[PDB]
Design a binder for this molecule. Structure first.
Ligand code: CU
Ligand code: CU
Lengths: 620, 620
């Protein structure tokens, strides 16, 4: 029915069959990425044509390929061989993770390094980390993963408590060869365990927490049709899921009176990078593009009722492809529910004698993913008043190192001899705008202070200014918290009853952006992270701020390249890319398991409605 | 038993007698302010000497007085006559909100102004607005109030929809005479009504909201003893209430293992000002110190269950004094409860096979107040992980004016001909720190970017720097969101197991501070609002950032004066004053009644604990 429905196991199996029939999926082939494509602009298509895009890896060393297929027509739309040294390697395969430890286990250099530390190889876990791009010429064109070691004293031990510093190895996961093993010197391996379920560390568990029961006698207020179409308190949207981006929101619209008014055509976290700020050669190459390199959606957790999602929850169980094209379901991977959100509006008027109070609520769509030591929760919220918000919740176990004897300017101490390198978690929200339709524009709004004098004799006046971003070349903006800078997306052709263009205002948290030196590899590979806001003209092939192939890919693609087209964005089909993140200087409180920290952004209506859109909310 | 218990009706009754049996209280006198004083520094003096501070007004015209009485021994500690022209007028009296309209009703200038606009005097409401200080020497030393008119078509009509622009009056509430009436010209009085309970405006109330049930079958996890002593999930504190400040938190401490560790000795919102940025002479003098001039606590609303506070709520009904010293109870003025706060910590570890998830919770202490057209919710939150947070929720009806023909750079249009002057809501949180005791210090922490080169060849390194604020002369700080600036309060004499001084980090929202010109009267009277953070040496008589008597005070009082003492704050008994606020450019969405908007701040432990303090939280 709806062209925005979630992919079904059948569609994935059909893609597999189409590829096989086309001779593109032999026994040496592996699916590194597979996702459904959004319908093309303009519903000119008589019927629906479900298309899937796939990245095909070859374990024998042959060139990989990018393929698009129409499962509807059972055809291969396009198939191109990729030159990875130029355009980038495919995303890391889940099957390649175990390869790093396995290969290193029999390498003489690795074994000698472990013996020098009196470590039993059988107990040494190796984290399969993306390699990035640096000065190792032999890595160009090859799929390389770098490994950092952690000791696990026993099956249920938390290896992160025992980092093996001064050692790092590089491995070619295709030819199965250890290219390099670097040992800069022995560091004491932190002895304290970090087992947060061990009574010896947790102590007696608290018995002081009484239960909080959240229930809905008449069920939830939202309805789900077509498997993923949501309707809740005037909001309308489709909940999609992609193995790379995770949860994607489609066709966010608000029912104002008798008309369905669009606001955002597509919303997603198009990239997220975790750059480390420790200059040690052991970790200075460390930059994890969880979204682009690992594909966060792929590792989404199955959420337990009453534990991960509390209350009356409706689940979606998205299906993705395994490495062979077989469908795999992520049971209860997406939670959907509405939750009370305190007071919405309130006023006790003396003159009228009327006391008015109304409560707020928000629709929540979320999922949680795990990538090695990190665990991230992605939350999208829709409020009664028209506000749209995204929130990222970062938790898990901090990535560790040894804590140098004389201290460090780039690492904090968590436990005796245990360090945690400084790093950032930076996201990029891609908002394909559709404020009352596709004809949109963006204005940067700053508060304007005024000087006391003629026309402002008492010096109390203050105003604001709005600057339209007309071409992509002038649409790379930075935050200015001091002047209350925000960005307004409006429709110059759609005006409210007061003759003003309708719009939505993006409120950023104004957290620090990418800290790395502008001449660094990461500053180029994650150029999007250096500025708070980017605006581009919509294009079918401009999906990620970092390009299609991020793994071991130098600069050359992504937002910087798109912006160069300097297209018209003043009253056109535009896309907003907002960078926002957390700068983490680990605290002792983050060890052995870190409490959630958050970051996000929100958009509030700005003259979108003709008056408050919640006057029809009952007292109840 | 506790010296921090809430004031009882009996204590207030005693205060009344003392004043009486001293000729201090009589038919010409009025209690402008009455509140209990906190215990003196040093509990070495067994037995608490419950003392109350009182501000006495005189309707006759005699000089007001500040009196400190001792309820414990029923005596008058001190009584001083005040020179208002010097130290400022007393807070506006509730009984004075009538006089402005009543007086103007029989004034020929006012009546002539209304007749010219064809307005029925019986339908004209007049807001009793603080006067401030502006080139009117005649007012100096006099108790003045300015009045702005709003038309109320009928008893249940919202007068805010019909502001009468181009007209303003100044009145003397003691001599009862209209000192002046300014009529700059006739402006059309907006005709549209703003009655948000009128079916024609609200339209059919939605019937789509299914109920959300929040219950605690076994009761709350917190205990209340001594009437206002709270104990919840290791937290310990005393919930106090003042007619000026509202809810005040005392002795915030955390039970870490076997010891109760103090964190904050006293937390309150010491001031809240609402400066307007409309240069029109009709409102250019507009600045409302809701806390300092009106006393937000006295107007606290009685919170309805299931409406204002949902779930298992434990109420506090603070008692205050009326204008004559009689005790008045504010039924259910304070809400206390705990609410679920999503995921606390989570990690699914591949190597250990252990999947771990824990839920977070927050203790909530709040109240809601109404000042004319505004309604503010004050919420304090205590989290399982040690985080302390404050949040202000602003709602009510926007203060209106006429919308000028030809537009305005300082007023927004909400409805046909209806304007909303730009303004700010700026709060000052007074945090009397006690990090593991009174020996504290504050450090400004900035993220530090590093240049690619020797020691940082890959240009990935980044660090942080901390600057200790040693003297008050260097303790007036500004925000710097770009460099992730925060402030850490630590105890140099109390170290964690890693030999690092324990501390708490204050995270600000970095919203714009006071926008008015530096030389404006408001910039001088609300100097605290021009900077984000102030640190002073504790002093029993330095309670408010604006001074004790804000109404019609020339300026420079409060923080600017305290800081001038340039006292030592490096490892001393100190107080942190954080300025934070909302800059409001009213939207159509804010009319006829505005949806809640928020602002606040939080403090998170920074090396305060030896490891996560929530490892003992059960899976539940
Ligand atoms: Cu982190
Ligand atoms: Cu406001």
């Amino acid at each position: 029915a709806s062209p925005f429905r979630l992919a079904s196991a059948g569609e994935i199996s059909e893609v597999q069959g189409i590829l096989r029939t086309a001779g593109l999926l032999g026994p040496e082939k592996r699916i590194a990425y597979l996702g459904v494509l959004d319908p093309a602009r303009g519903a000119g298509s008589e019927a629906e044509d479900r298309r899937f895009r796939v990245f095909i890896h070859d374990v024998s060393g042959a060139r990989p390929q990018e393929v698009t297929v129409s499962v509807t027509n059972g055809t291969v739309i396009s198939a191109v061989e990729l030159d990875t040294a130029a355009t980038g390697e495919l995303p890391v395969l889940e099957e390649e993770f175990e390869v790093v430890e396995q290969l290193l286990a029999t390498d003489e250099r690795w074994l000698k390094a472990l013996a020098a530390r009196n470590l039993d190889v059988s107990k040494v876990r190796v984290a399969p980390l993306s390699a990035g791009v640096f000065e190792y010429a032999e890595e160009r064109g090859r799929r390389i993963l770098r490994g950092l070691a952690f000791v696990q004293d026993f099956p249920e031990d938390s290896a992160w408590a025992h980092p093996v510093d001064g050692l790092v190895a590089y491995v070619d996961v295709v030819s199965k060869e250890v290219t390099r093993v670097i040992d800069t010197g022995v560091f004491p391996v932190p002895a304290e365990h970090g087992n947060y379920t061990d009574p010896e560390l947790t102590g007696p568990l608290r018995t002081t927490q009484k239960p909080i029961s959240i229930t809905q006698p008449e069920g939830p207020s939202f309805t789900v049709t077509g498997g993923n179409h949501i309707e809740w308190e005037k909001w309308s949207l489709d909940v999609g899921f992609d193995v790379r981006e995770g949860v994607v929101l489609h066709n966010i619209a608000f029912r104002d009176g008798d008309r369905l008014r669009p606001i955002i055509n597509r919303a997603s976290i198009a990239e997220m990078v975790v750059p480390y700020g420790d200059p040690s050669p052991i970790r200075s190459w460390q930059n994890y593009f969880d979204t682009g390199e690992y594909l966060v959606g792929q590792y989404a957790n199955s959420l337990e009722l009453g534990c991960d999602c509390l209350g009356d929850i409706t689940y979606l169980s998205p299906v993705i492809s395994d490495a062979f094209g077989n469908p795999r379901e992520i049971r209860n991977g997406i939670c959907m529910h509405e939750e009370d959100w305190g007071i919405l509006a309130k006023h006790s008027d003396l003159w009228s004698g009327i006391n008015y109070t109304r409560r707020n609520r928000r629709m929540v769509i979320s999922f949680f993913t795990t990538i090695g030591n990190y665990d991230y929760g992605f939350y999208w919220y829709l409020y009664l008043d028209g506000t749209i918000e995204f929130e990222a919740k970062a938790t898990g176990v901090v990535f560790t190192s040894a804590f140098p004897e004389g201290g460090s300017d780039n690492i904090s101490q968590l436990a005796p001899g245990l360090g945690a390198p400084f790093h950032q978690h930076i996201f990029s929200a891609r908002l394909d705008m559709a404020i009352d339709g596709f004809t949109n524009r963006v204005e940067e709004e700053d508060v304007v202070r005024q000087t006391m004098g003629p026309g402002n004799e008492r010096g109390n006046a203050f105003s604001r200014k709005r600057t339209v971003l007309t071409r992509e070349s002038e649409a790379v903006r930075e935050a200015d918290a001091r002047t209350g800078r925000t960005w307004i997306i409006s429709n110059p052709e759609s005006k409210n009853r007061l003759n003003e263009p309708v719009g939505y205002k993006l409120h950023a948290h104004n957290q620090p952006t990418l800290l790395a030196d502008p001449g660094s590899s990461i500053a180029r590979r994650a150029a999007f992270a250096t500025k708070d806001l980017w605006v581009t003209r919509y294009a079918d092939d401009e999906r990620y701020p970092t390009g299609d192939f991020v793994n071991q890919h130098s600069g050359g693609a992504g937002l910087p390249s798109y912006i160069a087209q300097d297209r018209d964005i003043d009253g056109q089909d535009i896309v907003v890319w907002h960078t926002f993140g957390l700068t983490h200087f680990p605290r002792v409180e983050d060890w052995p398991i870190m409490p959630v920290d958050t970051v996000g952004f929100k958009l509030r209506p700005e003259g979108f409605f003709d008056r408050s859109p919640v006057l029809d909310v009952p007292a109840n």
